[PDB]
Write a protein that binds this DNA or RNA. Structure first.
Ligand SMILES: [Mg+2]
Ligand SMILES: [Zn+2]
Lengths: 1319, 652
DNA sequence: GCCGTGACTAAAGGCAAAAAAGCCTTCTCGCTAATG
RNA sequence: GGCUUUUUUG
DNA sequence: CATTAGCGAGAATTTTAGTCACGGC
């Protein structure tokens, strides 16, 4: 079954894997993000509501005045997208909020309200999504890429001993908040723990440990295990457990109850541990010398003397034993201190702590944060508190809290926005465990530690920053309290927030200039992920690890689609089925497999969980009942793919396409190409140029319809129905009675843009592709966009290619092109350029634009009107004049044609400031625009009152007035006909009551349009009026273009050759493109050969259809033939029966197939060779696909048959005239007197320093000297040579490089004396 | 600089100077009234900071920033760094009489000439046109000639062709890696808007026709013209300064065509006859009565310079192929016939070409190279060599080999199941097993591809070199290697993890057949790493190049003889097995620090202070000398220069 | 008590080209123009 | 015409 | 006819090398 829109041309596809989850909306990542930014959220956890709740309410210092938020809404936009684009204004909506002012009496208990005031307050203008999902700032279209950054949380990184000579592994811990100051912990080579804040100087860790009101004893208790000693008769005994007997050497014999358990002198043994735990003995005597290395755990003082005998963190000795024994300290507490299990790293830091009172510690912290400041103790306390406990100056956000809890094996995933002492303690414990081997470090490249930050979060953060600024300002204002003197609107200033938002959208690292030169590039640019920008790596700081692809990248980011050059691996695009999680993590679809059955159940899995299950392969053979046909299948668990049984499998990929992006997806037969050339081909396909007439590619992917529909460049049928009126610019659709609205249903209107400038000087055109009186349904395709055909993507053309060397015209990589190609204009494109003229108000009279120009011939004015504007449709050439703008001296500063470019004028636009007289040409363009608008409006009227007067006539029929009179009587006369019949009069009189309302609202809306058109356009300050001119140029293929294929086999056109000299087959059909086969084995991208062979298969059917169509044979024999073609293949999912199709439909499909049957191919479920050969057998072509040829030059038969076929060839955006230029003599830089750079400035090339060394390497001296002195900067000398060349003498003059003197003065500008010497 | 409107664009220097002068005037006025000393301390300190920032920003600490929130340029900033005055305006400076275009191949062009668009020629030589026009009297005033040239009059093109007959032009491609990046040419006017370039020099430029932009300059003085004509012509640059290897080696289709010429077949139409001379052979081939390559006997004539600079001819019969006789047309007189009787691969022809330069000089060898151009292109066009889907003949055994492969691994994993082996042991076992399987499959597919069966003249199967296209692209050495052939039909091989580890399961599929999802994903690791390495190597390498320029830019040869005997003993490099490099080449092109002593006591094989070349090296080969101490630059005594004999023979 | 040692800090990181955009401190008041 | 910021070619 | 902005002009990460402070026998 199919809808009518695709019944025009059904494209056959191969593939055996049934589809379970179709491609979703390609833009759901972007639009649905910004969607979550504007609606009213009762939860108060998204967008504006969440931002406001974090700032409101605000209290005064006195506490008597308060400001609260109530509600907010978005005002309607002033214009639409088209008007904003035309007028160069930001498509935005006003922000409406309701504010609350509360006053509390100073002489009343807290909470006593003095007065209340509610008032709507203007906030500013916020830009809104286009229906396509873009931005408009100044008549231009910009898009916001989605930033990918390090997920807030905790990481444990290892330097692998790179910075140390011995290579000892160091482990460092980093905690990164969502917003605030950072924090780091490290191990020195000396095996000690240190802390640092904000990438500053290393500091001992324990400084902060006691900063939280921790005594040394508490720290030691937390960080170590206690060992207890009991003083028996001149002896000490210790309570021993077997578990604590790890990695120890028995210095003395271990024995209890008089029986020897462990020998003396050698290392411990496991069997001794087993026998000791079997005996279950705890207390054992210990020699005194065995304790010569034990550090006391706690403090010990004498009750009598009152002096400290020995505090914690000091080594004990026999004399200390004597004091503790004589003081009655029978129980001795020590640390376990097992270097192989629990290293005494903390104690070593305790031995180097400068202080312990925590007050000098706070002083040291204060000095650390800001050097050279008074050590004020309360200031230090405040700095610490608002640096690591501030609710506002520090935050971890919800996602950071969840990551922190998960990393530290915590259960609850919800917490506050600040840290805690227990958190830091646990971080230290885990770091110690990592040092001791417990646990394992994490990976930075793992997607479980990175997240995507969409445009919504960017807008939220910028708006929050602006709100913080404005609330600080209003807090300062309200500090000067008043007795309700002011109205709650004056104390707020919208300028900071508005400026911040507008500047972030306009000029920012992420607000890239979008390039809609063709739908595919637009889509792939919208779905691009960048690691640059704020809170991310830079172009240079990036290392070799981030650029690399990670084993967890599967299904989430395309491994083969990314720009190549100075930034590789950072601009990787999102995959097809990828979608964002609520927290902001990437997840992919999967199918649950139970009992060896693959059901249709779909789950979304994030990165981390992917390491806990078993994942199958997309192209895994399956039965009809979900059972793997064989018990041994290929699956991956953790970065590794190995065989597994049919029962261990849990999840399987939904489809094959979920590994590449759309750009890679459009590459046909990708599964037989190298990654490098696949990447090159995808990137080049991104840079395609619209064709004059679109043609469907013969070999496709299958998602071309999806990519064409999802991109907002082709008008889509919003509602089903039938076509009523057709036009090259407008489309009228009458809805069906099923989809009609209960009130004022009417019809629908679509306006098609015609030749509108793109963002890279390419032609944007919309093509109506439907006939009159044919039904349409919801979601169909009505108007073909640029590079689009019948709702199918169509970038380039399909040419007859033949891989064969030919007289060296394709020596290395070039392409030979027959003039037949340029005969049909199949590659000629349209380029649209802008020339703008600005009239400001300077001195010596304001800039005046008029046809009056002095010292100019009549030829220049011949293409000018009385108002000084070129007529529409003139054939302007280079060096001419377009608009005459002059300024009294009279100074002629009029705009002229750019040098070297010709074209034809298309449209002229004039902008005038408000309160400024509009000249005659402005009046004319205004009046034609108003006439067009009113004609369109009156057309919609005519239809609407057609409906309502049909209703009026129907009403009058039942009322008593005969139907014949209604037809005879005037149409408008129906309303005034006598209302004698009361029962029908109740509505007959009302009919006029709504007709008058409808006409009045039409009148007022028409007046609104008229006043909008007559409204003086806003301009930059000091600018009176500006004029704009559109130029349009046709570009045809000339030797030197950048023309490429779809598999990275780029190249340059060599020379146009007359068609009679091209090779031709026995049938006399010439081949128009001759590639170079030698580039195949080196590139080893064998896929294009298969593409060509399949191309032959397409037209092998194509000609036959043309055969019957020429012979006008019977439908029946035709109908089965197309039926036979579709049925070809092995277990093909797609099957179509033409029996249900009517004769007219069959004929239309056949005639639409005259150019060949399109063939689709899934990227990884592609067709193999057997069916290709079988399809070629259906045609009359040889199975090997290698037919003989004849040379036109010689007329003989080539000894070895060669391969020919159609291949999809593309023209890139690189024209020779865009690059071909040269400079003889022109302007000069005012500073260095050197020639400029850039084609637009008519500047010459740059004498590269590389080739300065290269020239110096040879014996060449005079040429180098000339290049350096005469043609560079010697203004005193180069003039003489210019005169000298005229006389014919090619004599030079040494001179002295002028730019060298400049440097002298620069050095003279310092306290450095430099000067030349004598002769 | 004033931009549009009343606003005036401001530079960083002016703002800093204004700040400093404002503070200076404030302190001056405040001091004149004897202000309290506390104020003057702060004012003096802030003036110190201001003058500090003006002289150098950000050096001391916090840097002054403007509305852009960026540090303003200082005097040191303008003079230091890449954006500084030196590296952007003293060692390199944009110049006039230059143009930029896109390269396009031209076969019909000779070696010493290049194409040029008409627009480029007119724009570049407009100054030359004016003088010539006034000389011929077409126009009297400069303004009249300027009006004439933009009108594209009939005489304009004629005079332009007259004035650019032999006016040399310079061509370079950024980046100019080595000194061959700049070459001179004699332009010829062509149509279009793109530059046409000679093919062979593209190999020297390392420039592929992938859209590379090409640059043109023009010399002005007579001295510059003669300088370019004498030095920068391609005819004077055939041996690279890097090494004696010729830099005009043919590549790709020329090599393919030449290989297709010299390759016999067991039997073909028109085989076994006898022909008077190579001239007749061309007659037979064009008429088509005989195949291009068939073993026949043809009378040929060769000239030898064995006499005292004299050519002597000889005549005989040889058992060669028709194609070789055809190729013998362009061979000059000196070269012996035996050098054009092999398969003539890429290695040989260049070597063969080199031999010509050893004997016939320069003009004969450049004419020979151009003739090789023309003949190779013509016959490659006639060749019709193309790649097809059936060309990649998949080996039959490979499939079942993979089968048997599973066998052993099906056991090895069991060893880990039983615990008799460790993870490392199993890993090494499977690695070795897969490597051996890869080698066996590669050998089998070599064996099946490189040969074919064909009926002899007497009706029996005979084995000869197969005519599968991929084999002509590979064995000839025109492009690709055995690794590519393995990648096409044979299995891919083991694949490396990003860190450096090797995945246990290798890519068992080949590019001719399909690839499952995971293996293609796995292969992307190495491809991405290689692309990143290529992207980031050009930045590090080129910078390295710069550091080599300044260290050794003071070295110029100044005197003929240093007059010292100190040198360095020179021996062939050896690692304990085969010698990495023989003693021959590394002593070539130098001079003897001391006279060569024979193993026979007190015998002087080579006199001291004598240049070395092939006529002397063979004597060392005949005597088989172990080592010789030769003069080197490191030992020359002359200061501020290098002894001429010390550097020895120049490569160019 | 001098040499060892570690801790702290300055300096550079490719070549050329194109295509776009957006700026060049900010606070204050009297007669002209913006505004009601 | 300087700077800044992107995007692209090799 | 009456009120007020306003701006024109004026003013207020990686890697390496080197140096310097502590400290160890
Ligand atoms: Mg290239
Ligand atoms: Zn010397």
């Amino acid at each position: 079954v199919y809808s009518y829109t695709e019944k025009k041309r059904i494209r056959k596809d191969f593939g055996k894997r049934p589809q379970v989850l179709d491609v979703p909306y390609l833009l759901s990542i972007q639009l649905d993000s910004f969607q979550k930014f504007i609606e009213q959220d009762p939860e108060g956890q998204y967008g504006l509501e969440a931002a406001f709740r974090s700032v409101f309410p605000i209290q005064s210092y006195s506490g008597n005045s308060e400001l609260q938020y109530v509600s907010y809404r978005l005002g309607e936009p002033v214009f639409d997208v088209q008007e904003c684009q035309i007028r160069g204004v930001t498509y935005s909506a006003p922000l409406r909020v309701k504010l609350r002012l509360v006053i509390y009496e100073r002489e009343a208990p807290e909470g006593t309200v003095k007065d209340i005031k509610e008032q709507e307050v203007y906030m500013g203008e916020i830009p809104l999504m286009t229906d396509n999902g873009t931005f408009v700032i100044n008549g231009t279209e910009r898009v916001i890429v989605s930033q990918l950054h390090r997920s807030p949380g905790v990481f444990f990184d290892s330097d692998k001993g790179k910075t140390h000579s011995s290579g000892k592994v160091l482990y460092n811990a980093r905690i990164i908040p969502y917003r605030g100051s950072w924090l780091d912990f490290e191990f020195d080579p000396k095996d000690n723990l240190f802390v640092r804040i904000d990438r500053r100087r290393k500091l001992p860790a324990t400084i902060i440990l006691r900063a939280l009101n921790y005594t040394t004893e508490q720290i030691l208790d937390l960080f170590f295990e206690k060992v207890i000693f009991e003083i028996r008769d001149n002896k000490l005994q210790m309570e021993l457990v077997p578990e604590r007997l790890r990695g120890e050497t028995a210095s003395f014999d271990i024995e209890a109850n008089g029986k020897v358990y462990v020998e003396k002198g050698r290392r411990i043994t496991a069997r001794h541990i087993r026998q000791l735990e079997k005996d279950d003995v705890k207390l054992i005597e210990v020699p005194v010398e065995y304790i010569a290395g034990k550090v006391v755990a706690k403090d010990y003082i004498d009750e009598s003397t009152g002096e400290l005998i020995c505090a914690a963190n000091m080594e004990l000795s026999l004399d200390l034993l004597a004091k503790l024994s004589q003081s009655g300290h029978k129980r001795i507490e020590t640390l376990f201190t097992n270097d192989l299990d629990h290293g005494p790293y903390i104690s070593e830091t305790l031995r180097v702590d400068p202080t312990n009172d925590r007050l000098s510690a706070l002083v040291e912290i204060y000095r650390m944060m800001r050097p050279g400041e008074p050590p004020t103790r309360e200031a230090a306390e405040s700095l610490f508190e608002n640096l690591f406990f501030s609710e506002d100056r520090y935050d971890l956000s919800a996602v950071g809290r969840m990551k922190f809890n998960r990393s530290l094996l915590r259960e609850e995933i919800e917490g506050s926005g600040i840290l805690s002492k227990d958190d830091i303690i646990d971080v230290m414990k885990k770091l110690i465990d990592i040092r001791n081997g417990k646990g394992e470090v994490d990976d930075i490249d793992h997607l479980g530690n990175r997240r995507i930050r969409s445009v919504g979060e960017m807008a939220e953060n910028q708006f929050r920053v602006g709100l913080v600024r404005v609330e600080r300002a209003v807090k300062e204002r309200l500090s000067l309290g008043d007795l309700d003197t002011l109205m709650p609107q004056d104390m707020i200033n919208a300028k900071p927030i508005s400026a911040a938002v507008k500047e972030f959208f306009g000029s920012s690292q992420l607000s890239q200039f979008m390039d809609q030169n063709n739908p595919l590039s637009e889509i792939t640019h919208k779905r691009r992920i960048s690691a640059l920008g704020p809170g991310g790596l830079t172009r240079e700081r990036a290392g070799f690890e981030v650029r690399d692809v990670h084993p967890t990248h599967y299904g989430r980011v395309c491994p083969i689609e990314t720009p190549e050059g100075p930034n590789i691996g950072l601009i990787n695009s999102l995959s097809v089925y990828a979608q964002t999680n609520e927290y902001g993590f990437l997840e992919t679809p999967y199918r649950k497999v139970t009992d060896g059955v693959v059901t249709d159940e779909i789950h979304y899995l994030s990165a981390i969980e992917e390491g806990n299950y078993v994942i199958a392969q997309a192209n895994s053979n399956l039965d009809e009942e979900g059972h793997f046909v064989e018990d041994l299948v290929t699956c991956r668990s953790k970065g590794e793919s190995s065989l597994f049984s049919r029962d261990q499998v849990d999840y399987m990929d939904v489809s094959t396409q979920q590994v590449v992006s759309v750009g890679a997806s459009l590459i046909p037969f990708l599964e037989h190409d190298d990654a490098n050339r696949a990447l090159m081909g995808a990137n080049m396909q991104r840079q395609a140029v619209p064709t004059l007439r679109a043609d469907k590619p013969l070999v496709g992917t299958g998602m071309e319809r999806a990519v064409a529909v999802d991109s907002g460049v082709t008008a889509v049928a919003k509602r089903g129905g039938v076509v009523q009126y057709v036009d090259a610019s407008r489309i009228v659709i009458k809805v069906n009675e099923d989809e009609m609205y209960p009130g004022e249903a009417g019809i629908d209107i679509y306006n098609l843009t015609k030749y509108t400038r793109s963002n890279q000087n390419t032609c944007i055109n919309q093509m109506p592709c439907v006939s009159l009186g044919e039904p349409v349904e919801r979601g169909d395709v009505l108007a073909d966009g640029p590079s689009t055909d019948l709702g199918e993507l169509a970038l380039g053309q399909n040419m007859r290619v033949a891989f064969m060397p030919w007289n060296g015209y394709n020596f290395e990589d070039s392409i030979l092109v027959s003039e037949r190609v340029v005969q049909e204009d199949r590659f000629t494109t349209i380029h649209i350029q802008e020339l703008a003229c600005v009239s400001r108000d300077t001195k010596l009279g304001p800039e005046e634009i008029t046809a009056d120009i002095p010292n100019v011939g009549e030829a220049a004015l011949s293409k000018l009107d009385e108002s000084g504007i070129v007529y529409i449709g003139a054939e302007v050439t280079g060096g001419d004049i377009l608009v005459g703008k002059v300024t009294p001296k009279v100074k002629d500063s009029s705009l002229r044609v750019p040098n070297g470019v010709s074209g034809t004028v298309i449209d002229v636009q004039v902008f005038t400031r408000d309160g400024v007289e509009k000249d005659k040409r402005a009046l004319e363009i205004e009046e034609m625009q108003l006439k067009q608008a009113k004609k369109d409006l009156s057309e919609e009227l005519q239809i609407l009152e057609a409906g309502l007067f049909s209703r009026i006539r129907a009403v009058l029929v039942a009322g008593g007035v005969e139907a014949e009179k209604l037809d005879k009587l005037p149409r408008d006369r129906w309303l005034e006909l006598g209302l004698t019949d009361e029962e029908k009069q109740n509505q007959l009189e009302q009919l006029a009551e709504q007709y008058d309302e409808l006409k009045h609202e039409f009148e007022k809306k028409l007046e609104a349009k008229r006043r909008k058109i007559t409204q003086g356009d806003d301009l930059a300050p000091g600018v009176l009026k500006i004029v704009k001119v559109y130029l349009a140029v046709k570009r045809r293929i000339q030797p030197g273009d950048k023309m490429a294929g779809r598999h990275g086999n780029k190249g340059v056109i060599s020379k146009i050759n007359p068609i009679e000299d091209m090779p031709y087959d026995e049938n006399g059909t010439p081949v128009d493109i001759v590639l170079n086969p030698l580039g195949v084995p080196s590139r080893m991208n064998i896929g294009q050969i298969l593409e060509t062979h399949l191309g032959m298969a397409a037209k092998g059917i194509g000609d036959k259809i043309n055969a019957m169509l020429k012979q006008q044979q019977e439908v029946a024999k035709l109908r089965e033939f197309i039926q036979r073609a579709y049925d070809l293949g092995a277990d093909v999912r797609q099957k179509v029966d033409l029996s249900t199709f009517s004769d007219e439909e069959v004929m239309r499909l056949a005639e639409n197939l005259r150019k060949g049957m399109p063939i689709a191919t899934p990227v990884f479920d592609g067709a193999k060779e057997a069916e290709i050969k079988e399809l070629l057998k259906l045609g009359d072509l040889p199975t090997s696909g290698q037919i003989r040829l004849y040379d036109g030059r010689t007329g003989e038969q080539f000894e070895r048959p060669v391969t020919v076929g159609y291949m999809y060839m593309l023209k890139l955006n690189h024209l020779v005239d865009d690059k071909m230029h040269a400079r003889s003599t022109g302007s000069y830089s005012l500073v260095t007197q050197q020639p400029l750079g850039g084609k637009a400035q008519f500047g010459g090339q740059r004498f590269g320093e590389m080739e300065v060394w290269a020239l110096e390497a040879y014996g060449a001296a005079y040429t180098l000297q000339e290049m350096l002195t005469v043609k560079s900067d010697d203004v005193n000398g180069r003039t003489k040579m210019y005169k000298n060349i005229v006389d014919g003498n090619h004599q030079m003059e040494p001179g002295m490089p002028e730019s060298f003197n400049v440097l002298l003065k620069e050095i003279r500008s310092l306290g450095i004396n430099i000067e030349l010497e004598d002769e | 600089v004033p931009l549009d409107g009343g606003r005036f664009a401001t530079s960083d220097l002016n703002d800093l100077y204004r700040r400093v002068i404002n503070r200076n005037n404030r302190l001056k006025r405040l001091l004149d009234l004897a202000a309290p000393d506390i104020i003057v301390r702060n004012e003096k300190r802030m003036l110190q900071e201001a003058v500090d920032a003006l002289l150098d920003n950000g050096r001391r600490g916090r840097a002054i920033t403007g509305s852009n929130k960026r540090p303003l340029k200082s005097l040191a900033d303008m003079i230091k760094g890449k954006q500084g005055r030196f590296r952007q305006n003293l060692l390199g400076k944009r110049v006039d009489y230059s143009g930029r275009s896109v390269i396009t191949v031209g076969p019909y062009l000779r070696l010493h000439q290049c194409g040029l668009p008409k627009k480029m020629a007119l724009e570049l030589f407009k100054p030359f046109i004016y003088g010539k026009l006034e000389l011929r009297g077409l126009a009297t005033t400069i303004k009249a000639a300027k009006k004439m040239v933009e009108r594209e009059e009939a005489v304009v093109w004629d005079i332009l062709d007259e004035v650019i007959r032999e006016h040399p032009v310079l061509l370079n491609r950024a980046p100019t890696l080595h000194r061959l990046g700049i070459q001179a040419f004699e332009p010829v006017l062509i149509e279009g808007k793109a530059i046409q370039l000679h093919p062979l020099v593209c190999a020297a430029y390392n420039a592929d026709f992938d859209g590379d932009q090409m640059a043109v300059h023009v010399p002005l003085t007579l001295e510059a013209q003669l300088e370019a004509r004498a030095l920068m012509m391609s005819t004077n640059n055939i041996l690279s300064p890097a090494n004696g290897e010729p830099i005009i080696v043919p590549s790709q289709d020329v090599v393919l065509g030449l290989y297709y010429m010299t390759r016999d077949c067991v039997n073909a139409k028109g085989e076994g006859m006898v022909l008077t001379g190579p001239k007749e052979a061309e007659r037979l081939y064009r008429s088509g009565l005989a195949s291009l390559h068939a073993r026949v006997k043809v009378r040929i004539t060769e000239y030898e310079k064995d006499a005292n600079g004299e050519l002597v001819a000889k005549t005989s019969l040889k058992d060669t192929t028709v194609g070789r006789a055809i190729l013998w047309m362009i061979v000059p007189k000196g070269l012996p016939y035996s050098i054009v009787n092999q398969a003539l691969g890429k290695k040989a022809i260049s070597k063969m070409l080199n031999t010509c330069y050893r004997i016939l000089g320069l003009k004969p060898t450049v004419i020979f190279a151009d003739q090789i151009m023309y003949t190779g292109f013509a016959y490659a066009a006639r060749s019709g060599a193309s790649v097809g889907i059936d060309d990649m003949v998949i080996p039959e055994k490979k499939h079942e080999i993979i089968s048997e492969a599973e066998a052993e691994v099906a056991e090895i994993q069991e060893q880990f199941q039983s615990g008799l082996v460790t993870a490392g042991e199993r890993y090494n076992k499977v690695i070795d097993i897969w490597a051996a399987a890869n080698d066996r499959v590669s050998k089998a597919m070599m064996d099946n591809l490189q040969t074919e069966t064909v009926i002899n003249r007497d009706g029996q199967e005979e084995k000869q070199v197969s005519f599968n296209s991929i084999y002509m692209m590979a064995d000839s050495g025109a492009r690709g290697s055995a690794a590519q052939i393995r990648q096409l039909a044979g299995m891919r091989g083991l694949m490396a993890k990003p860190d450096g580890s090797i995945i246990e399961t290798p890519i068992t599929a080949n590019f001719r057949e399909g690839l499952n999802v995971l293996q293609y994903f796995i292969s992307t690791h190495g491809a991405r790493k290689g692309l990143a390495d290529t992207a980031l190597k050009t930045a590090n390498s080129g910078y390295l190049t710069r550091r080599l320029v300044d260290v050794a830019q003071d070295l110029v040869v100044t005197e003929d003889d240093c007059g010292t005997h100190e040198g360095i003993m020179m021996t062939p490099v050896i690692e304990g097995g085969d010698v990495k490099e023989p003693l021959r080449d590394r002593v070539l092109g130098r001079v003897t620090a001391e006279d060569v002593l024979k193993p026979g006591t007190a015998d002087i094989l080579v006199p001291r202070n004598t240049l070395l070349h092939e006529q002397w090296c063979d004597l060392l080969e005949e005597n088989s000398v172990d080592a010789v101490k030769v003069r080197s630059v490191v030992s020359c005594d002359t200061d501020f220069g290098v002894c001429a004999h010390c550097y020895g023979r120049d490569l160019a």
